[PDB]
Amino acid sequence: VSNKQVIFRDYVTGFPKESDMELTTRSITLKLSTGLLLKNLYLSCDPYMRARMTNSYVDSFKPGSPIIGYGVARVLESGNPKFNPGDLVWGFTGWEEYSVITASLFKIHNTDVPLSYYTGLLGMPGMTAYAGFYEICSPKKGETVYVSAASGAVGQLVGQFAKLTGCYVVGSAGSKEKVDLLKNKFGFDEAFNYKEEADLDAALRRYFPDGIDIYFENVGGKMLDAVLPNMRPKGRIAVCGMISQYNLEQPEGVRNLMALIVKQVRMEGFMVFSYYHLYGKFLETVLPYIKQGKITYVEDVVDGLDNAPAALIGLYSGRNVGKQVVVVSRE
Amino acid sequence: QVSNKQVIFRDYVTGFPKESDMELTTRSITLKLPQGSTGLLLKNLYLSCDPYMRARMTNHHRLSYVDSFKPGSPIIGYGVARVLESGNPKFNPGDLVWGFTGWEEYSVITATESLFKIHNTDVPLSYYTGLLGMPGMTAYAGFYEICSPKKGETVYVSAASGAVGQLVGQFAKLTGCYVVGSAGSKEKVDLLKNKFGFDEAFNYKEEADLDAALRRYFPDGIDIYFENVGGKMLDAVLPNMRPKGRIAVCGMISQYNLEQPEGVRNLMALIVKQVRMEGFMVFSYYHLYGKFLETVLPYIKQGKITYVEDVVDGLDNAPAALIGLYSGRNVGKQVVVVSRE
Ligand SMILES: NC(=O)c1ccc[n+]([C@@H]2O[C@H](COP(=O)([O-])OP(=O)(O)OC[C@H]3O[C@@H](n4cnc5c(N)ncnc54)[C@H](OP(=O)(O)O)[C@@H]3O)[C@@H](O)[C@H]2O)c1
Ligand SMILES: NC(=O)c1ccc[n+]([C@@H]2O[C@H](COP(=O)([O-])OP(=O)(O)OC[C@H]3O[C@@H](n4cnc5c(N)ncnc54)[C@H](OP(=O)(O)O)[C@@H]3O)[C@@H](O)[C@H]2O)c1
Ligand SMILES: CC(=O)CCc1ccc(O)cc1
């Protein structure tokens, strides 16, 4: 059968563009070995993928070969005993209709949620929100929480977890549509459009007159400098991402780190890879909340591999509204 | 009546401080408290020069943590003094104390709860401005409460020959860590290797590429950075941290005299290396003071911990000694002796 693929053309400098990926089709036979033959259903667009386009923490993409990243797929055939034909899995797969995988995947049991959730809410981004918030921030009822990129895959979940814990939660996002989602769907206490704030420090002083106990950091740069002098004593910054920096040849300087001393702040980075032993517990905690409607999720869903390059590039302009999903083929 | 020489704060400072930002005057005073006073009459013996005092020479700051100095009034800071007279039953004449006092020969103290009563005089009294006072406590709290050090881990100490750093490094050695310090002269580097027992040490002024220098001294990276300096030094450390590394943010003295702090560019290293970078203030740790003293005094007695002070004689020399911190003039902990006892 035919197998369209999104190919990585060549290593990227600065921002990515659609020409850095190329669409192609190849002829393949659907059989097989100890590996796995997958029909790819959904693909995630995740900000970290930009780092794999550079010639730090995982191998770079290989020019001429398909983009790889997190997806949800159906097992067509297996030469490994732990997976059988018909299994649904999430994990790393290729940007293509069908992939042969030499491997680590999670077998999906609960199918009474939209399968696309295993690219986001129930996949790596949701695990990231859970680990960063519950394992790094030591949150307590009554504490104030600021979430940057608050309407995104990770942010929208951090904010809801913080509300469930009894925190006072403010988010920022880059459009009126996203700010409305934060206040009207996700139940943030307050939210603002950071692109329309002339002075970020002023906005944070208004929304946190007594300071910020917890900053869930997704953005870096200027936003982090605005946060630092607004932290409360013994405040915490969970350093999750710094997406404002990912396309710079030279990262921007952050000037306000003396605030860490005078406010005795713990600023700690983490990688979700180190928390996957908690994935079972994460499911135990979140799947009931989804059931009882305490946790909701917004996805941005585009159809077809042909649209995956623009969906990935759109992350760095804020084009996605919520978690960016690419539908290769519905279940 | 006796004379009371004083160091007066002349006016608020912009940029680096200079001698002329302070004034020396002599006043007449009577060694007697007012009737009904509940305060202390102190004779000041030793004064500390400490880097944080620069912040008090500016009128106001977003990140202020204490009131600034008042122009026309004496400099205030940590010192060691003897009680001459007391309106507070907790102190009797002849008691020796350490805590905040005036840059003068005699002070009257109203707020007496910052004062620690010295019990052990088995040691030079000057120790209570440094090793056994606030800088020593800082090193103890920052290293043992913030850094979670373990045997075999690698430790980098900036301003390592200073009041805080020289103790951090020795604590690290005693814990079984591998310790490298940097300082800004050959004299200081020699102390690090030959008196304090650091595994290695370098003069950071001799290294045009600090990141490369740290790669040479830490071939497998840094578990713990005891941060005293900030700026380019911090940026050189960040890519050299190990996974689950820790930075104890104690001070950033390279920033204290700038109108705009320098930008630190390598913070994404915190993510990929899962580093905890945590600031702290020693004032939050004085509940551990008794335990600190129980720990360090036997080490001092057994010669297992040593200390280097920079000692200048006389209040006339105090302004130069404070200014000198910011160009590295002090060799070890900067002390001013007001009256040698
Ligand atoms: N440490 C880990 O293990 C880990 C794991 C996953 C993700 N992360 C990080 O978590 C963060 C969010 O990931 P996500 O999946 O949830 O992405 P996302 O929020 O769904 O999408 C990215 C968003 O970033 C915002 N953005 C882009 N450029 C920006 C800029 N220059 N300044 C400010 N905001 C900008 C946009 O939202 P606006 O419209 O609001 O601008 C955009 O929608 C990223 O930094 C990611 O790298 C970390
Ligand atoms: N609670 C707290 O958080 C707390 C408490 C006390 C102190 N501190 C901080 O800890 C640090 C050390 O204090 P300390 O009492 O021990 O002082 P110190 O080291 O005894 O004296 C200051 C030293 O700073 C170094 N220095 C000056 N300018 C520098 C620059 N631009 N770059 C690099 N090094 C520079 C000099 O040493 P070189 O010759 O090596 O340059 C100088 O001797 C300070 O930043 C201080 O504010 C924090
Ligand atoms: C789930 C992952 O594998 C990566 C998460 C991520 C990590 C670092 C970063 O800078 C952005 C996203």
Author numbering:
A (entry chain B): 9 to 40, 44 to 66, 71 to 118, 121 to 348
B (entry chain A): 8 to 348
What's in the article?
4-(4-hydroxyphenyl)butan-2-one, commonly referred to as raspberry ketone, is the major fragrance compound from raspberry berries (*Rubeus rubrum*). The final step of raspberry ketone synthesis is catalysed by the NADPH-dependent double bond reductase RKS. To begin, the RKS enzyme shares sequence similarity (77% amino acid identity) and similar kinetic properties to the previously characterised promiscuous *Nicotiana tabacum* double bond reductase NtDBR. To complement these findings, we also present a crystal structure of the NADPH-dependent raspberry ketone reductase, which we use to relax its cofactor specificity towards NADH utilisation for an improved low-cost *in vitro* engineering.
By analysing the 2*F*_*0*_ – *F*_*c*_ Fourier syntheses, two configuration states were observed at a 50:50 ratio due to crystal soaking. The mixed states could be as a result of NADPH and ternary complex formation to the active site, thus displacing any NADP^+^ present from crystallisation. In the ternary complex state, additional electron density for HBA binding is observed, with *π*-*π* stacking between the HBA and nicotinamide aromatic rings ([Fig fig4]) with a hydride transfer distance of 3.06 Å to the alkene double bond. Furthermore, in the ternary complex, an additional patch of electron density consistent of a flexible loop supporting Y72 is observed. This flexible loop forms a cap over the active site (closed loop), with the *para* hydroxyl group in HBA moving towards Y72. With respect to HBA binding, the substrate is bent within the active site and is encased by aromatic residues Y59, Y72, Y85, F107, Y263 and F290. We speculate that this this closed loop formation holds the HBA within the active site prior to transition state. Finally, in regards to cofactor binding, in both states the NADP(H/^+^) cofactor is bound in a typical conformation as is observed in the previous related structures with the binding specificity provided by a triad of hydrogen bond based contacts with the G191 backbone nitrogen and the side chains K195 and Y211 ([Fig fig4]). Importantly, K195 can interact with either the ribose 5’-phosphate or neighbouring 4’-hydroxyl group. In the case of the RKS enzyme, position G191 provides flexible control for engineering relaxed cofactor specificity.
